[PDB]
A paper describes a structure:
The protein is believed to form a hexamer that uses ATPase-driven conformational changes in its AAA-domain to deliver substrate peptides to its protease domain. Paraplegin is implicated in the degradation of proteins that come out misfolded after transport across the mitochondrial membranes, and in cleavage of mitochondrial targeting sequences.
We purified recombinant human paraplegin including residues 305–565 (corresponding to the ATPase domain) in the absence of excess nucleotide. We determined the crystal structure of this protein to a resolution of 2.2 Å. The protein crystallized with one monomer in the asymmetric unit, and ADP was bound in the nucleotide binding site. The structure shows the typical AAA+ domain consisting of a five-stranded parallel β-sheet flanked by two α-helices on each side, together with a carboxy-terminal bundle of four antiparallel α-helices. The nucleotide binding pocket is located at the interface between the β-sheet and the α-helical bundle. Despite high concentrations of ATP and Mg2+ during crystallization, ADP was clearly seen in the electron density, and as in previously determined FtsH structures, density for a magnesium ion was not observed. The conserved P-loop in the Walker A motif (GxxGxGK(T/S); residues Gly 350 – Thr 356), is central in binding the β–phosphate of ADP through hydrogen bonding interactions with the backbone nitrogens of residues 352 – 356, the Lys 355 and Thr 356 side chains, and a water molecule. The adenine base is stacked between the hydrophobic side chains of Leu 357 and Ile 448, and hydrogen bonds with the His 492 side chain, the backbone amide and oxygen of Ala 312, and two water molecules. The pore loop of the paraplegin AAA-domain contains the sequence Ile 382 – Gly 384 (IGG), and alignment of our structure with the FtsH hexamer show that the Ile 382 side chains of paraplegin line the central pore in a similar fashion as the Phe 229 side chains of FtsH. Most of the known disease mutations in the SPG7 gene lead to premature termination or map to the metallopeptidase domain. Some mutations, however, have been identified in the AAA+ domain, and surprisingly, they all map to the C-terminal α-helical bundle.
Numbering used by the authors: 304 to 332, 339 to 410, 430 to 531, 540 to 559
Amino acid sequence: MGVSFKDVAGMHEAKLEVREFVDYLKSPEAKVPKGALLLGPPGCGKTLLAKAVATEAQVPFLAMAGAEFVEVIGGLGAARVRSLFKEARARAPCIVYIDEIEQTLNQLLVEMDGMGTTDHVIVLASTNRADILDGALMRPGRLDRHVFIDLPTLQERREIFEQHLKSLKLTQSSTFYSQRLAELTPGFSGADIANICNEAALHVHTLNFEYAVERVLAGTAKK
Ligand SMILES: Nc1ncnc2c1ncn2[C@@H]1O[C@H](COP(=O)(O)OP(=O)(O)O)[C@@H](O)[C@H]1O
């Protein structure tokens, strides 16, 4: 079994917001959801959440990187977009995930505009770039909504530390330490937090706190 909501720490408002897509994918049959933009800084769980939504609905997850688009080879991106959406229709219900953002873009707009009631695909698109909100993916009949996912708050950081201390079998006193690790890590992303824990795992079922603390102060300069 894959990434689920259990593996996604914090992000409580965003979980409430992708619920409608979980519900739709679980039984197509209100307005028909097409999908959503996940917006925010890197390493903050956009991809993890999109994977979790597929797992929760129990459907396939089909991904395309925004960097299979940028027109370097003529026609190639359009052709990959078409294959993607044809596989998605055949494997439906399912999630199509476009990670991290115009023949290739126009083809995507065509696939989306061409999505009717019968298709049962949800498109989740992620980006670090806010001005994507102003463009063609957010026009009527395309991506329905966006969800802003920011750097984790103190409490969210507590939860992310706890999740990763437990994934790495360092559960003993993980909750004792999580509070201070959170206080020490303003402006850290979930990825930064995962890297601290793993670096400390790479140095029995309890965190080496004094080392974790060292890596937090190192990473505070440059992560
Ligand atoms: N909310 C979170 N809960 C648990 N781990 C997280 C969270 N956010 C980030 N991470 C960790 O950071 C990794 C990279 O994040 P990713 O999903 O690539 O984020 P993004 O798509 O926003 O740039 C995740 O696979 C996970 O290990």
